[PDB]
Write a protein that binds this ligand. Structure first.
Ligand SMILES: Nc1ncnc2c1ncn2[C@@H]1O[C@H](COP(=O)(O)OP(=O)(O)O)[C@@H](O)[C@H]1O
Length: 1175
């Protein structure tokens, strides 16, 4: 169907007798076959060889392997698969991505099991790289029995979790990444490395009861994704057996280092391997841990399958680079000095897993029964040269374009077949229009068909470069050849809404008491009820406060002051500290709402709907728009169209595509005749956004111009500044656009980027421009959503959480500063013509530091950059680094965090101990954003003993984790300065002592009281065994979230949604949980009638604390509930509990309901208004 688009076109291409000649030659399986043809013919040749049976194709680099893999999936779909290459060198102390290992093992198991439907269709073409071809592997990797999960299979829970542990699956309390799994009572969550969505399986007894795929963000199940049998393949290329623990204990005996275990060294690694847990960099130790004879990839191919090698010369030339780089990483990582100096393991054994040479792989493939064939673009004498010519590539000069369309017209006039293959979405109709203007009959082909004779067929399919086959009377021309651009290729949100982490000793702020230190969580019984309480230390200095589970909304994690405040006490010292800040925030809210109102009543020309060109400009997008991006463009366009001048923020990570929203909004404002500006803090951003605005808006009468610091004063004084005549439709500029001399003619839209970095004078300038014209800001720092909805009326902010393309996480390595590892990593990043960040914050020595870098890599262009330089030199240096003039940038953290160099994907942090967690995460984030995998090296000095807090900190970032250990604790800090960039106040004085969460909560109070300018807890002490049992929710961090979120639910349907959350996430509700739910609904019923407290004064009586009763309801209390009296002075209603039998007092749901009906009949309504027997 639409799954094999170019199957008909290729099936037509095979009609050429040269490809059929190749099919005949390969049909008898000859020993030597040398083919010669153009590069773009690869997809053809393979597709011919696959007609006689399966085969393995080898490409030079991973990019060519991905390209040919897609081009073959366009004709074969699921039958052709890609055997990926490791992101790490074989002996490097870093493990590759779990997704890569998953794809490798799934592909090998598919090669060993073609009949297995659950793994996929039988293989016909396997495309791989030189690395994966040369990199050996253990022959027992395919024999590892995966964890097969099906609805109805009879299994045993603990055996399943144990088997998952053996397959290098990391156990966590919440599934967030691939290769993870969480264990809950009767429910197993697991994220296989090859599955698109993580799957949750419900066990009952000794067999699975249900299966359903869920989403990572809300952790809620997706019912519209049907889940068949899932095959959980291992996540590492090894098995954690008892033998590998034995040898890890023999090797672990030497280099023991029992005390003061360094994080990244080999005593810790081998110690944890003897303990059985998987650790990073484990694969390199395969020849010593699991010693066998390692075979190559070609053995796992089904017997008889041949091997076609594309451009073998380049395959060899790169192969030498794999062997050299891998050898350098082996010597570097496992030198005598780096293994702790003691009993250095011999490297000869470790050489077993290293890359085999080209000749060894050749003879190993031939001696295994698999022929070795070649396809080379260069002409050879004894080779079978195919009748295939490459496509004419019109460089972009439209005379060549018209000539190409003319040769197409002549070819179809003769009767030959012409096909124009366009992989882009929205570009086929454009080619149809171009052919119509060139007077050529065009037709958008049905996906999977062949071009009809006499008409050119515009087809949507994956192709890079076209191919001309005169033997088949066929001419295939790709969109790439016509436009000179390569089109590479859905997305799931990553909200991850489930953490409010707490560790022992952490500081929290209680609204009614103050700052205190967390201790633990306990449970006490008062009348047969297991109750849960969270404890805090409040300096009296030994006073402990047990906050219950009904008032968790008053607990805010203390953030703000880096220096800790002193814990509060039972006195009245804290209420004042609340009140003064409460008086210090409304001053901010005043400016906020006054800006919103001045914006509301201001006169500004609205923007009409999108003109006809906007569709073509939006469809000229190289990539694919994202759902969050589409909603953001709709909101931005609508706010432009609304008469109120626009003041909208765009929140998203660096590398998520908000700049496209900028260019599209700017274009929309241009189409209505209004010129626009873009304000950036640094000149580098003016150049980047300048080039993006050029490329996206080219081909239209729109002159884009920029005014940076380095724009010469001739063009600056004349062209840019003198453009008050409508000469510029859009100007990208730095702060020079904010001086007095500037002037606009019909300024229509302002685009701000990284508004936080601007100067204060420039900030007040931009805010002054806000009221008069439409503004549109972009931010990489996120904001707390509580502030998003707290200040929603004055300033709308749209969030983008759908990644445009899967940006796989960078590979972090914590370790001692070894020069060989640094040099090896820098040279590996230089191999792909990449760049690297080297961080040495001590400015005094930065020069010397860079010199030492040049000691390690002499062929590296190394430069320095720091904040002490004047901007005229610094921005020029950073410009040189962005223009690839330099290879390694030694800089301080201030300079590094604030650059967007996409080509830089390797980071070296010297003296990583000195940096905080947040700074380390920021540093790491600035690499590995593009299509390339990033690397990060957090290094601590080896000449001094590491500190305790550096050991802990480095340990948190060591095991790369998104958990509540600190990634979330230090994410809040990333939101603090974001708030400072959003709201006007920068002072942290009132934050320190109140808590930033309570600070912006008071901000919420003030701005909600000011927004409505025109307008001008219940305690239940009942003997009801209600709690969330630990067996139901094992993880305390999640159970506290269930408590809090259940308490915060404000209506019955919200409580029901919480119930559905607990049911889906953790399983069916137990009795104490349902009783707690009924207690919450009882709290709502109290709030409707304003009851503050319902407490049992004694074992036989109950008191409703605040009620006034008129004479009618007082008499009704006497008649319907005898024995009870109403005390008007204290204004309480005290009634006695009826005994259950003739004896025990009533409890649990009988008591809850009885109290409900009592409240009802006392407050007018009948006893049959509602029942608490639900849920
Ligand atoms: N939908 C997409 N898929 C893949 N890459 C994209 C997509 N949109 C934009 N990009 C790439 O990512 C970058 C877009 O982000 P950028 O323009 O740097 O602003 P920001 O990083 O703030 O989103 C560009 O370099 C672009 O090539």
């Amino acid at each position: 169907s639409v799954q094999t688009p170019i199957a008909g076109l290729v099936e037509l291409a095979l009609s050429d007798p040269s490809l059929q000649d190749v099919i005949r030659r390969a049909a008898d399986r000859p020993a030597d076959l040398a083919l010669v043809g153009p590069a773009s013919a690869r997809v053809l040749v393979a597709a011919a060889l696959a007609q006689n049976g399966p085969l393995l194709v080898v490409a030079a680099t991973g990019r060519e392997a991905d390209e040919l893999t897609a081009e073959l999936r366009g004709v074969f779909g699921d039958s052709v698969a890609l055997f990926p290459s490791w992101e790490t060198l074989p002996h490097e102390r870093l493990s590759p991505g779990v997704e890569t290992v998953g794809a490798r093992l799934m592909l090998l198991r598919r090669l060993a099991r073609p009949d297995d439907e659950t793994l996929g269709a039988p293989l016909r073409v396997v495309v791989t790289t030189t690395r994966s071809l040369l990199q050996p592997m253990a022959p027992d990797l395919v024999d590892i029995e995966p964890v097969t999960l099906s609805v109805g299979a009879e299994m045993e829970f603990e055996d399943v979790v144990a088997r998952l542990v053996d397959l290098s699956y990391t156990r966590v309390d919440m599934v967030g990444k691939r290769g993870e799994f969480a264990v809950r009572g009767g429910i197993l969550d697991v994220f296989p490395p090859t599955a698109e969505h993580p799957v949750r399986v419900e066990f009952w007894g000794d067999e699975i009861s249900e299966m359903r795929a869920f989403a990572i963000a809300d952790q809620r199940s997706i019912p519209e994704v049907p889940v068949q049998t899932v095959v959980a393949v291992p996540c590492r290329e090894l098995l954690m057996t008892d033998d590998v623990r034995e040898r890890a204990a023999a090797l672990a005996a030497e280099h023991p280092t029992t005390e003061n275990t360094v994080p990244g060294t080999v005593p810790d690694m081998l110690a944890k391997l003897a303990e059985g847990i998987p650790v990073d960099g484990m694969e390199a130790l395969l020849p010593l841990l699991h010693p066998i004879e390692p075979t190559t990839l070609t053995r796992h191919l089904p017997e008889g399958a041949p091997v076609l090698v594309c451009d073998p010369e380049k395959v060899r030339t790169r192969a030498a680079d794999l062997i050299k780089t891998g050898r350098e990483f082996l010597e570097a990582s496992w030198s005598t000095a780096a293994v702790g100096g003691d009993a250095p393991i011999d490297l000869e054994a470790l050489g077993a897993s290293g890359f085999v040479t080209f000749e060894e792989a050749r003879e190993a493939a031939r001696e295994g029964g698999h022929p070795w064939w070649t396809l080379s673009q260069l002409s050879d004498e004894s080779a079978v040269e195919l009748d295939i010519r490459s496509a004419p590539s019109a460089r972009g000069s439209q005379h060549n374009l018209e000539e190409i369309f003319a040769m197409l017209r002549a070819h179809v006039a003769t009767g030959g077949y012409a096909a124009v293959v366009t992989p882009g979405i929205g570009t086929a109709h454009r080619v149809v229009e171009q052919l119509g203007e060139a007077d050529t009959a065009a037709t958008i082909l049905e996906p999977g068909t062949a071009p009809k004779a006499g008409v050119v067929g515009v087809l949507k399919g994956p192709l890079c470069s076209g191919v001309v086959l005169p033997g088949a009377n066929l001419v295939i021309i790709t969109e790439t050849d016509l436009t000179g651009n390569r089109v590479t290729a859905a997305a799931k949100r990553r909200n991850v809404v489930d953490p409010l982490a707490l560790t022992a000793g952490d500081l929290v702020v209680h609204d009614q008491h103050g700052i205190g230190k967390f201790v633990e969580m306990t449970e006490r019984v008062v009348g047969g009820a297991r109750r849960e309480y969270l404890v805090l230390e409040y300096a009296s200095g030994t006073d402990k406060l047990y906050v219950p589970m009904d008032s968790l909304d008053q607990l805010s994690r203390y953030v703000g002051g880096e220096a800790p405040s002193l814990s509060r006490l039972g006195g009245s010292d804290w209420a004042n500290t609340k009140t003064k800040a409460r008086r210090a925030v409304r001053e901010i809210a005043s400016e906020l709402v006054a800006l919103y109102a001045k914006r509301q009543s201001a006169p500004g020309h609205a923007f009409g709907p999108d003109t006809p060109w906007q569709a073509e400009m939006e469809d000229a997008f190289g990539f694919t728009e994202t759902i969050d991006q589409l909603t953001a463009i709709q909101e931005v366009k609508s706010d432009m169209e609304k008469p109120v001048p626009m003041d909208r923020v765009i929140c998203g990570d660096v590398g998520y595509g908000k700049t496209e929203i900028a260019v599209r909004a700017a274009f929309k404002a241009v189409q209505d005749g209004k010129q626009v500006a873009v304000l950036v803090p640094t000149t580098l951003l003016a150049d980047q956004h300048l080039q993006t605005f050029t490329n996206r808006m080219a081909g239209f009468p729109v002159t884009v111009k920029g005014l940076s610091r380095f724009t010469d004063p001739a063009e600056s004084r004349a062209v840019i500044e003198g453009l008050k005549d409508g000469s510029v439709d859009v100007v990208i500029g730095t702060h020079r656009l904010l001086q007095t001399g500037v002037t606009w003619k019909d300024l229509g839209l302002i685009i701000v980027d990284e508004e936080q970095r601007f100067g204060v004078e420039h900030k007040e300038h931009i805010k002054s421009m806000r009221t008069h014209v439409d503004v549109l800001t972009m931010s990489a720092t996120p904001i707390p959503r509580t502030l998003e909805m707290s200040l929603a009326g004055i300033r709308e902010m749209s969030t983008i959480l759908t990644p445009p393309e899967e940006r796989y996480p960078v590979l972090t390595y914590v370790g001692p500063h070894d020069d060989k590892q640094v040099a090896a990593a820098l040279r590996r990043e230089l191999l792909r013509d990449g760049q690297a960040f080297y961080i040495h914050n001590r400015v005094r020595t930065i020069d010397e530091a860079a010199a030492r870098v040049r000691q390690l890599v002499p062929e590296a262009r190394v430069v320095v950059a720091h904040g002490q330089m004047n901007e005229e030199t610094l921005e020029k240096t950073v410009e040189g680094f962005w223009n690839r003039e330099y290879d390694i940038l030694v800089c301080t953290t201030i300079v590094e965090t604030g650059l967007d160099i996409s080509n830089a994907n390797t980071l070296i942090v010297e003296r990583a101990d000195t940096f905080g967690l947040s700074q380390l995460h920021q540093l790491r984030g600035r690499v590995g954003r593009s299509r390339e995998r990033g690397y990060a090296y957090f290094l601590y000095p080896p000449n001094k003993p590491l500190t305790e807090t550096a050991y802990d900190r480095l340990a948190t970032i060591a095991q790369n984790n998104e958990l509540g250990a600190g990634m979330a604790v230090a994410m809040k800090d990333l939101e603090i300065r974001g708030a400072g960039n959003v709201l006007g106040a920068e002072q942290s004085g009132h934050v320190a002592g109140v808590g930033f969460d309570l600070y912006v909560r008071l901000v919420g109070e003030a701005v909600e009281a000011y927004r409505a300018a025109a307008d001008g807890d219940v305690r239940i002490d009942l003997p009801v065994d209600a709690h969330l049992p630990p067996e139901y929710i094992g993880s305390d961090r999640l159970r506290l979230e269930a408590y809090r979120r259940l308490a915060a639910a404000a209506d019955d349907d919200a409580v029901a949604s919480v119930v559905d959350e607990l049911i889906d996430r953790y399983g069916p509700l137990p009795e104490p949980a349902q009783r707690l739910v009924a207690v919450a609904r009882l709290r709502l019923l109290c709030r409707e009638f304003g009851i503050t407290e319902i407490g049992a004064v004694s074992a036989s009586t109950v008191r409703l604390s605040p009620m006034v009763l008129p004479d009618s309801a007082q008499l009704r209390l006497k008649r319907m509930y005898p024995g009870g009296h109403y005390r008007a002075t204290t204004s309480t209603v005290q009634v006695p509990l009826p005994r259950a039998g003739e004896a025990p007092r009533i409890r649990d749901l009988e008591l809850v309901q009885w109290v409900a009906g009592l409240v009802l009949v006392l407050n007018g309504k009948g006893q049959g208004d509602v029942d608490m027997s639900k849920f």
